[model samples]
Target: GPMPGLSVKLRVAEAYPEDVGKRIVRMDKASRAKLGVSVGDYVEVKKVKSVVARVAEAYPEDVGKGIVRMDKYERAKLGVSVGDYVEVKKVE
Candidate 1:
């Protein structure tokens, strides 16, 4: 089957303490729109590994930063660390 979704490349950033272990990733509104995903929708994060996570809007200070903030668990699941670049895409 064909998968139809948008993808974006973004730098990894640390998630807010409260969001840790919640299986969520935060990105600027623009990035979310580019990936065709809305808050609560799932996205696939990939580098050498891939993991699906729910989407959330970035913090006010993080808007337009071209980065994705996720917790250590999700970063580990994607085999990436803060400062690394990863490809994120909307999941069907």
Candidate 2:
């Protein structure tokens, strides 16, 4: 089995040892070669139109943009802040 392209909107989960944030998601090793994203890079994940985003976490850079959000349990609560790349899926 193989994984297909992920076009779905993802939400910010958490940061790793540090939170720098993610910029994009690429499966190709070459594509990511130039992408300066590390384990703590801040990544912007999309939320479902029907889902409500809480103030889980926000980047110190996003002060008045209303980008703060987090869930009960996840990287947000774990101290992962804005600009941190994370893995997410349907809240099902």
Candidate 3:
């Protein structure tokens, strides 16, 4: 039984009000404190470390002229919606 990445298995019971007995993602300190887990204990933690940093670089046309966000002035100037996806650049 080669459980390479398998850390521990949590036999999740139904959290109150929720019909589904949701399977626990993982056991960490904060959840352990919340649920009062001790030695050989189990809890759940937010999957924070799963984030991947996106190193997006812009093409030549987007050098100095990265699209700034549609703020009050920019929206009036460009006639854009507030939630429009604007381009950015890493000047460093």
What lDDT score goes with residue 53 in model 1?
90
Query: How does each model score on lDDT?
Result: 0.87, 0.32, 0.26
Greater TM-score among 2 and 3 belongs to: 2
Q: What is the C-alpha RMSD of each candidate to the true structure, in Å?
A: 1.8, 12.8, 21.9
Clashes of each: 0, 21, 0
TM-score of each: 0.92, 0.22, 0.19
Candidate 1 lDDT at 22 equals: 94
- lDDT score of model 2? 0.32
Q: Which structure is stronger by TM-score: 1 or 2?
A: 1
lDDT of 2 by residue, 57-80 (tens): 334444343222344334333345
- Residue-level lDDT of model 3, residues 9-34, one tens digit each, is 22221122221122222223332233
Best-fitting candidate, measured by TM-score?
1
